Design a protein around this ligand. Structure first.
Ligand SMILES: NC(=O)C1=CN([C@@H]2O[C@H](COP(=O)(O)OP(=O)(O)OC[C@H]3O[C@@H](n4cnc5c(N)ncnc54)[C@H](OP(=O)(O)O)[C@@H]3O)[C@@H](O)[C@H]2O)C=CC1
Ligand SMILES: NC(=O)C1=CN([C@@H]2O[C@H](COP(=O)(O)OP(=O)(O)OC[C@H]3O[C@@H](n4cnc5c(N)ncnc54)[C@H](OP(=O)(O)O)[C@@H]3O)[C@@H](O)[C@H]2O)C=CC1
Ligand SMILES: O=P(O)(O)OC[C@@H](O)CO
Ligand SMILES: [K+]
Ligand SMILES: [K+]
Ligand SMILES: [Zn+2]
Ligand SMILES: [Zn+2]
Lengths: 333, 332
């Protein structure tokens, strides 16, 4: 058991102004900032700044040997790139999200390219809820999709334990699952005035659960496989579809939950509750809303189990006919 | 602000990873705080000091030269190192040589009651080969500190419901589940990995505290009871070397029984906790713990006053109620 977690986590209005304080506490002096064109406006300091584009191709091409840490400011891509870069340089990474679209905020996962892999958790998470509150609404709605995914991820994890003796941690699993349930329950019971705040807390919690389990298992299962398959097909067929990771995972969750329901009647109705929670925050729940033809959904379903060697409710895979029935019966198509 | 450990290592030989960890944290000159019985595990060049020597004097900065503190040993070594680090404004590394309580990774300092919050240790380095060999009584005491999470979380939920205290379901259930898994392991195995599963549980419990920013998920009425016992030991000058965990275990037995009375859903909880303690040879009675029945009773009646923290004890037990409770649960 060797586990790397964040040292500092700040979630509050104006948190972006604590960067200096946090750097000082960690005895860090020379960061490189990674950001995006749309998020550069929040980089209010004098550190060196670089856009994640102009790293992601040149890639490996000591230009960076002077920096003692990396600060990722922005969306999932900014953070993911900064995280990867920090790993390559052997230095600490500070995560400064400007939205709440995915759990990459505090996770040890780097997802530049599939397959994903593990690195250190960010040494600090500085989440300015004033900035995040104003981020495009669609991104906040997408975060719900990433959170509900923990439910099917955990069901899949238990399943792999039972059927394949995969290493399993009950306390990590229930932590992850409960994070999602807290948020669902908040979404279904409230006026949503603190949604952004509770969402960020959930995404961060989800990152910590990953760190603690030393695996993306508590946060990524078949629903994520489905989303990754969608991604492969967008690239393959050159679809120009602006769907987000969280949105895809949310829809995946709906379907995968339903598969677990078939085998365990105690869970019956789970998928509908999830669906409701997604609709309540305006996340998409159908292929049409997400921007996909029904055939892409189906194909993604049939290929999802092959995306990674990770046992899930999909087992050895869905037939085309099964996939269609599933998507039909859950209202996705 | 939430402060958690950065690094956590739990494995055989972990004590040899001190330097690796110091290097990762860019740290070079620690002050080591240890005990006379644990000094033998201090195999390195660093300055060493015993926790007595510090605890006498306190305020009197001969320490300017150190860039961190490493606590090596039992709960007291760790607690003192933790406190000292806080006072010096430098990071603390926790190196437990046994598994006797959840101070290992917690943000709590407990040198004087009442206890208070500081930073969680920056690193936890838990050598399960050393811990495995620690006195068995200490390992048994750890079980007492873990089962406490069950009543702590029940008390937390109760305070939420009856007083609108701030509550976090996902922290609570994490804490609770840590305890449930260990109980279920203790009741269902040959115990060959007890020390390991115990240390993981104790560390998890520390993390839950940090995440909740409160000792709520790990400390409730059972702890109030243990603190009361401590007050009485000092007051009556009793010479009784009961451990914190042992006291908390026995507290949990009783407090879980109080919760059971109000909620049928929990039937057999108290019994199962008791069984689990017996299975690892933790004490479950006053006699075993070394206390006269009147001390137990007095501790029960004063426990709700130990801190301003609502529990199943509510506004307090009468002497009569306390005696019944202790009787009914087999404590006396
Ligand atoms: N590591 C992990 O575990 C995970 C990582 N990921 C990674 O994250 C990516 C998904 O992240 P996601 O956020 O969904 O997508 P993007 O990172 O592509 O972000 C979407 C867009 O929103 C913009 N944006 C973000 N915040 C604000 C703000 N406050 N104001 C205005 N615009 C804003 C970004 O701007 P800009 O263009 O300036 O960046 C970006 O253009 C994936 O491609 C993958 O790389 C995804 C899931 C999990
Ligand atoms: N703040 C927190 O989170 C909490 C802190 N605590 C702290 O912990 C204390 C209780 O800790 P606890 O460990 O129960 O009691 P002690 O620290 O008194 O430890 C008991 C004894 O065990 C010895 N010891 C420890 N490990 C070994 C080993 N491997 N081999 C031989 N001897 C060993 C210690 O030796 P030595 O004499 O050399 O130290 C000590 O003599 C409290 O007084 C409090 O300060 C307790 C609960 C919660
Ligand atoms: O392991 P993957 O599927 O990238 O997921 C981890 C991350 O996306 C959070 O859920
Ligand atoms: K997730
Ligand atoms: K405890
Ligand atoms: Zn994800
Ligand atoms: Zn305790």
């Amino acid at each position: 058991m060797i586990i790397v977690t964040p040292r500092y986590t700040i979630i509050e209005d104006g948190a972006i102004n604590k960067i200096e304080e946090i750097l000082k506490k960690l005895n860090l002096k020379n960061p490189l900032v990674i950001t995006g064109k749309n998020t550069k406006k929040y980089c209010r300091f004098f550190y060196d700044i670089v856009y994640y584009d102009e790293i992601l191709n040149n890639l490996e091409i000591k230009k960076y040997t002077a920096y003692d840490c990396v600060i990722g400011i922005g969306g999932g891509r900014s953070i993911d790139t900064g995280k990867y870069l920090a790993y390559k340089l052997g230095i600490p990474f500070i995560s400064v999200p400007t939205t709440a679209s995915n759990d990459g905020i505090a996770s040890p996962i780097v997802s530049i390219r599939q397959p994903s892999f593990m690195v250190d958790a960010p040494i600090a998470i500085i989440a300015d809820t004033e900035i995040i509150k104003k981020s495009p609404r669609r991104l906040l709605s997408a975060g719900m999709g990433d959170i509900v995914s923990n439910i099917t991820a955990v069901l899949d994890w238990k399943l792999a334990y039972k059927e394949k003796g995969e290493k399993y941690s009950e306390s990590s699993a229930i932590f992850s699952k409960t994070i999602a349930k807290e948020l669902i329950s908040y979404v279904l019971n409230s006026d949503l005035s603190e949604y952004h705040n509770k969402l960020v807390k959930a995404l961060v919690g989800s990152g910590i659960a990953i760190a603690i389990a030393n695996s993306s298992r508590p946060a990524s299962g078949s629903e994520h496989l489905f989303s990754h398959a969608l991604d492969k097909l967008k690239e393959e067929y050159n679809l120009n579809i602006n769907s987000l990771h969280g949105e895809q995972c949310g829809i995946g969750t709906i379907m995968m939950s339903y598969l677990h329901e078939k085998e365990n009647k105690k869970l019956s109705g789970l998928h509908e509750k999830i669906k409701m929670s997604l609709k309540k925050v305006d996340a998409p729940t159908t292929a049409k809303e997400l921007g996909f033809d029904e055939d892409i959904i189906i194909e993604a379903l049939t290929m999802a189990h092959k995306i990674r060697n990770r046992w899930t409710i999909l087992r050895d895979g869905l037939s085309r006919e099964e996939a269609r029935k599933l998507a039909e019966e859950t209202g996705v198509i």
